[PDB]
């Protein structure tokens, strides 16, 4: 468990209050569009399994499938973005706090670096 047990982590909290400071996903997010596509596929498979016209029957059912998938996908994207942002924040804080472990290195140009040449023949 890497990020479990992080200080100040509220149990069973899908999205903490500190996640409100991050940019929310756009409604036209391609991930949200793919979630809606998954919902549409679920509706089509529902019609096919129940032996209804695949594209025609149950327009309300297809609409509810798409809407539910988009809703859960939006909240899932929010949580995923928050977790990745938290990981990057903690990594940068650790790099700041351990300069001995992460030291700057002298930069030498390729005119100074000697690299062996392997001919192709």
């Amino acid at each position: 468990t890497m990020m479990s047990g992080r200080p100040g982590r509220v149990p069973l909290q899908f999205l903490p209050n500190e996640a409100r400071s991050l940019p929310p996903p756009k409604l036209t997010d391609p991930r949200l569009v793919y979630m809606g596509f998954l919902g549409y596929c679920s509706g089509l498979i529902d019609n096919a399994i129940r032996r209804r016209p695949v594209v025609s029957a149950g327009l309300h059912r297809q609409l509810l499938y798409v809407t539910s998938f988009v809703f859960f996908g939006y909240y899932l994207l929010k949580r995923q973005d928050y977790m990745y942002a938290l990981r990057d924040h903690d990594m940068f804080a650790y790099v700041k706090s351990h300069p001995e472990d992460f030291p700057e290195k002298d930069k030498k140009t390729y005119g100074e670096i000697l690299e062996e040449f392997h001919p192709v023949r």
């Binding site: 005119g111 690299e115 001919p119 192709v120």
Partner: protein, 174 residues
């Protein structure tokens, strides 16, 4: 002609001997050349004159793209991706230019051989030497870089060559 530079594409001054006939027989080659001029050369000349006259009415220009010099792989820092990309592109363009230089010299050599004809071995020594020098330099620069050649690999090869030369010079001076 003014289409190409006479200095870039040299050509010796032509020396056509004056005809000095020794027979009273007619010249079939002369008669056929006259017929060719009267039947082909004049019609094609008139057609080209009309075409050029049409071209001159809607004259427009196109230009030759100019590239400014950018720092090369020697100046680029280690794992500096932007400078590395710029240097690699410049090196590739220079490689293409050098290939075309070798092509120009080779074309000059071929033309001189064909022109000199039966005495090409002696009269084309000047063009053979230029091709020898150009080919030697081009081979030394881009001989065995490989399919995935790059400015870094060419620089490494040049460094190896320079180290070998320095070692040889130090041994000679020792």
């Amino acid at each position: 002609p003014d289409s190409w530079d006479k200095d870039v594409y040299p050509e010796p001054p032509r020396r056509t001997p004056a005809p000095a006939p020794q027979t009273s027989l007619p010249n079939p080659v002369t008669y056929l050349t006259k017929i060719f001029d009267l039947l082909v050369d004049r019609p094609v000349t008139l057609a080209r004159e009309f075409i050029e006259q049409q071209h001159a009415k809607n004259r427009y220009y196109y230009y030759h793209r100019e590239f400014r010099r950018v720092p090369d792989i020697t100046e680029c820092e280690e794992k500096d991706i932007l400078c590395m990309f710029e240097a690699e592109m410049q090196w590739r363009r220079d490689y293409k230019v050098d290939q075309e230089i070798v092509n120009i010299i080779q074309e000059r050599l071929k033309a001189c051989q064909q022109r000199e004809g039966e005495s090409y071995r002696q009269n084309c020594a000047k063009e053979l030497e230029q091709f020898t020098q150009v080919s030697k330099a081009f081979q030394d620069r881009y001989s065995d870089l490989g399919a995935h050649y790059s400015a870094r690999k060419c620089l490494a090869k040049q460094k190896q060559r320079m180290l070998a030369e320095r070692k040889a010079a130090k041994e000679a001076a020792a």
